[PDB]
Design a protein around this nucleic acid. Sequence first.
RNA 1: AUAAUAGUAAAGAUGAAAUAAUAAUAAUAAUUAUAAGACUAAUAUAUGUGAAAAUAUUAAUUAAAUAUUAACUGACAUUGAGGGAUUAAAACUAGAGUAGCGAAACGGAUUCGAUACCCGUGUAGUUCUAGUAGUAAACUAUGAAUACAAUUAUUUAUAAUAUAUAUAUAAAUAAUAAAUGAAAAUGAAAGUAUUCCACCUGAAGAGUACGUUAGCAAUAAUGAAACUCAAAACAAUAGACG
Lengths: 125, 142, 203, 137, 34, 91, 92, 87
Amino acid sequence: MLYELIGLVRITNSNAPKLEAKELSSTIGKLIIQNRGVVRDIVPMGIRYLPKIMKKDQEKHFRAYHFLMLFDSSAAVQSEILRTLKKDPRVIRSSIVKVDLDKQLDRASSLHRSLGKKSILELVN
Amino acid sequence: KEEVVKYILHGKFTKNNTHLTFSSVVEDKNLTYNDTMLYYLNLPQKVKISLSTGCLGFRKAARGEYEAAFQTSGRMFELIKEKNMLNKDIEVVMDDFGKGRAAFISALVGKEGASVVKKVVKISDATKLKFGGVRSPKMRRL
Amino acid sequence: TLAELLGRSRIAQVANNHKPLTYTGKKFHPTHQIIETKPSTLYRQEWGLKSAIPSKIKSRYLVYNDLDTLERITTFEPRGGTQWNRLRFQEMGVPIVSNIGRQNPFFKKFNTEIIGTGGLSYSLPGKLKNSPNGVIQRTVVPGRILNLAAIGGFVADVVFFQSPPSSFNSMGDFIRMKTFLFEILEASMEKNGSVSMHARLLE
Amino acid sequence: EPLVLSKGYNIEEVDKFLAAIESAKRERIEKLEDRREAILRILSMRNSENKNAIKMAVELARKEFERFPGDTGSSEVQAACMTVRIQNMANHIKEHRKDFANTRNLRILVQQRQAILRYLKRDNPEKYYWTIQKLGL
Amino acid sequence: DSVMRKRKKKMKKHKLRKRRKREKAERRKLSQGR
Amino acid sequence: KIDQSLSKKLPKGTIYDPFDFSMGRIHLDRKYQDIMKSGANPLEFYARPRILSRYVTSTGRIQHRDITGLSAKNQRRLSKAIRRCQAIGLM
Amino acid sequence: AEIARSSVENAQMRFNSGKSIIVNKNNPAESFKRLNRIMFENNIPGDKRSQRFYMKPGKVAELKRSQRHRKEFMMGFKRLIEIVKDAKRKGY
Amino acid sequence: PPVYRLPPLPRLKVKKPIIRQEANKCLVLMSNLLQCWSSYGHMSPKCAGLVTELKSCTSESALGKRKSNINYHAARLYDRINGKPHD
RNA sequence: AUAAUAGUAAAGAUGAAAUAAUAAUAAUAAUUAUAAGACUAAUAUAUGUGAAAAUAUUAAUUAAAUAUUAACUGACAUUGAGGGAUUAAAACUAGAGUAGCGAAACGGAUUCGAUACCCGUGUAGUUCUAGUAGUAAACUAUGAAUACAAUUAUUUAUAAUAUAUAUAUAAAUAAUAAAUGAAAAUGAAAGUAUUCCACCUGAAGAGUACGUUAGCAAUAAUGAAACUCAAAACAAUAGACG
Ligand SMILES: [Mg+2]
Ligand SMILES: [Mg+2]
Ligand SMILES: [Mg+2]
Ligand SMILES: [Mg+2]
Ligand SMILES: [Mg+2]
Ligand SMILES: [Mg+2]
Ligand SMILES: [Mg+2]
Ligand SMILES: [Mg+2]
Ligand SMILES: [Mg+2]
Ligand SMILES: [Mg+2]
Ligand SMILES: [Mg+2]
Ligand SMILES: [Mg+2]
Ligand SMILES: [Mg+2]
Ligand SMILES: [Mg+2]
Ligand SMILES: [Mg+2]
Ligand SMILES: [Mg+2]
Ligand SMILES: [Mg+2]
Ligand SMILES: [Mg+2]
Ligand SMILES: [Mg+2]
């Protein structure tokens, strides 16, 4: 089951912002692969400012680093990945959402589909 | 240090009464980058002159009228002029669409708020609404 | 059969369209078939359509979309300005040639694009036009400056030696009132069917 | 079972197909193995939905019951197809007590099954009895 | 039923409810032990 | 000198008419006056606030189908996508 | 600190809501009018007015339906009168 | 676009024929004078001509100068313009 | 709601006023900072979806769902007494929860009076978890199914057309023809027909009493008679009245 992810990570360090994001991406990707899963794409997005001053437990955030991870897994695995994301202090907002494979097998991320490229083959070419 | 960046003119205009409030945005010139940026975003304010249209001797019902509201606005403007909080720029905000709101804006436009207008950088409404929330009172029969 | 006669007949001949009669966008060529009457037929309100047309219309020409609608009125507009633009263009006598090096389309599955000109000019470029005074080298045409110049039912790009201040700056945005003479250099026609004329202001 | 695939695939066939592709590429290792593993993970039952598993079970039931390869509406095969869904629906209900719409749906489904077995009994009694015995009824 | 006709029924229902309220202690006495 | 509202600027390649110079033409013009309409489900754009913000009022409200001028289904998809967006941080 | 200084109130502009406008010193009244228009478009005063009391959910649904109907009638009327005007213009 | 067909109505007619006439000159002058007297104290000679103009306007009567027939075309053409089905 | 900041005399309420956990113990308004519940702005049309109750912040899981083709089954169908399951709001029994609202109660107004309408405190209740109960203007006041009948306009989906055209289908929604109807009006049903179930036979008395069953209970279902009238009811008409 192809699940897209959107995590808005924390950026504490000013000079080197992407490090925490990169670590998060590594860890969640590691979890996925240990657990019968297959990460397809890890689309980065920019250091984008949040719409409002969004706050985690005993913290506050105005800017964050955004990224999509487009992975396959079981439902239980995914649910648990989501839970771990919710638990951790270095992400502000997390959101897993299903990508339906009833018609196709190759499906790109939501952003790529919006641009034009339906399958990841198109992106490759 | 205590540097006044700008003033904010707040006006809460309810059904029955107006509340005009002047306040200085006090920035200190003097830690993590994110924390500093957050501080810069939401600078502390200090109240300078509070005012409500009963302060101008309008008792009970007459304080829910713009005539009282207009007078209060004029008094506020006079206080601003005299007490000397006109050196930096001003930011107007409003609430709750009363009669007094209409009076306040008219006062600002006219000669009563002549000295203030030139420092007023931005008008910016901030009325509160609810996306569901607490249930309101039952609609009075009358 | 009747069906064959209907197919032949003059209402079937008018090719149908539901384009707006009021089109406030850019008009590069005619939208609708212009339809004239004779004066006699106008006098008894007959245009060769489904119904009689209102006696308020005194113009002989019109344009239409529907013979009859749900509103119980034919959708028409009493105007045939496009014929006059064509006639003006003919009078001006500036032959349209493709500025791109290509053969003239009139000589030698379906292509809906405009075959050369749309048929505003079937004139050929090689002719001169003599008169009592002599052979006309420069085509003299009166037009109006807008700010571009309106020259005989066409807007045209304009050029000059020096920009005249006395005529222009005296009435800055009432230049449309005063008619100025023009020397039309050439007329090119683009893919969209717009006639791109080029004139020169004479004084 | 451990190497069962979703989407109407078969693991033996998939491997053969991959080998054929490799041969074609050669004509025209670790990485290839990793890609194959990724493909298997994608097409595995345990990563896929329950719906695919149910569909597979229904297909299996049809294969078992079909009195010839073409027939799919055989009263017995219909009953068998109903049963798999009923089992799954029953399991769902056991998880979710107050889901009353889906209990109703289950109920309808077993009523339909009963009706078709009743029909089978009238038409062809021995066959009906055999079907019942198979289904555990 | 029009509204006017309904109003008689409503009134009857109200009267019945009142009677039940009145005869609560009496009803209780009657019910228990017999 | 004169304002822009009371003078119709005829484009370069266009045809005109005597009527076209008039006040009445200008009035007529005044009277008579996208990626989601193009034919792609708006629920691809839930990680694209920039594009979804076009279908939203200055405050943040979603615009009505009378305003936005969409197919009913396509409008509802757009609305869904917007709501998803604001559930996430982005938008 | 240096980084914060460099970010010269960049977020402050985009963070604020649409209920905000920069005043032209030549015409404050114009600015106020524009703000009022914006508020009207967003239906904020009308929303505020609605929120003063509670109305039973079926009753508010009925009201909403009635409003919708009224809207649709008005644009049907507009359509009709535009046709009438066209007919008048032409001669019908 | 979304067309909106009305039901069968008794009579197509503008509900209120607001004429939308221009505001009175005398009233405008009076408002201007009032605005001037807001500024510049009570009665300074900046508004010396304005007062005179107001007086001239309001000499014979307090106001200077003292209907839209759209019903006729709608009323006439309603039965035509209907998409009302046949009898 | 609590706390801090600075700041000054009223604030809050109403038709106008007061009473109150309002305020010279320093409030209200403002700006911050914590917590708590409960609700879900726009989109929205309840369009649609659901058997009906219902059902619009987001996501995931499991379940069910549309159309057209291909193949298969071979009348397996319809309706459905009894029966079964679900069934708004209020109510009740436990155990949490309790911001706002708010029966009752108390207080202030209003009034000749005011056990009210308005205002203030505000308990049950409203919220969740597990149940009980099985009623509502539970309404489209219209039981379900099938075959059929004259038009138009709207959308929605399907197919072909040479992706954007004008076409063929369905589906819904809105105007009607015919037909039906006490009329209002119904309009693919309140038409033409066929099938099956439920129910009605003057008004009062009465969905009352007695009885029985079920429920923790409130109650729910079942459901008479005497006595008394020539009444009682609906659609529409023209007035008078507001
Ligand atoms: Mg209260
Ligand atoms: Mg059955
Ligand atoms: Mg009845
Ligand atoms: Mg039903
Ligand atoms: Mg909503
Ligand atoms: Mg049945
Ligand atoms: Mg409800
Ligand atoms: Mg309850
Ligand atoms: Mg309780
Ligand atoms: Mg009370
Ligand atoms: Mg129950
Ligand atoms: Mg009852
Ligand atoms: Mg009942
Ligand atoms: Mg209901
Ligand atoms: Mg008839
Ligand atoms: Mg009959
Ligand atoms: Mg009707
Ligand atoms: Mg008995
Ligand atoms: Mg009972």
